[PDB]
Structure 1
Amino acid sequence: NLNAVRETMDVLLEISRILNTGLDMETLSICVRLCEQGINPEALSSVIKELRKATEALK
């Protein structure tokens, strides 16, 4: 199965690359596995945009 769940995870990177989302390969597997738990994705759109916001105040 791990061969299938690798391909399905590899295709999903491209549709996140042309949609111009800042999610790299590591943060994607984190968010995919976290969405795979059952958390509502309308909220995750806010934590990433805020974690990236407080990260910019440091630099």
Structure 2
Amino acid sequence: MSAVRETMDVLLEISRLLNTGLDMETLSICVRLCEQGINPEALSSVIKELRR
């Protein structure tokens, strides 16, 4: 559980630097999609539309 919290903290830091504008909730969802073997190319396109 603890390592899973520490790892998310690293990822949030990766997000701030790149100016993604993904929250703690939006990042955690993205991860979960990513872990199931979804193509990141497709995933990025969907996201842009959802912000529109």
With normalisation by structure 2, the TM-score equals 0.87
RMSD of Structure 2 on Structure 1 (CA): 1.5
Partner of 1:29: 28
TM-superposition CA deviations, 1:1-59 (whole Å, max 9, x none): x111111111111111110001111010011111111111111110010111xxxxxx9
Structure 1 stretches of 5 or more lacking a match?
53-58
Give structure 2 stretches of 5+ with no counterpart: none
Aligned residues: 52
Bigger-Rg structure (1/2) = 1
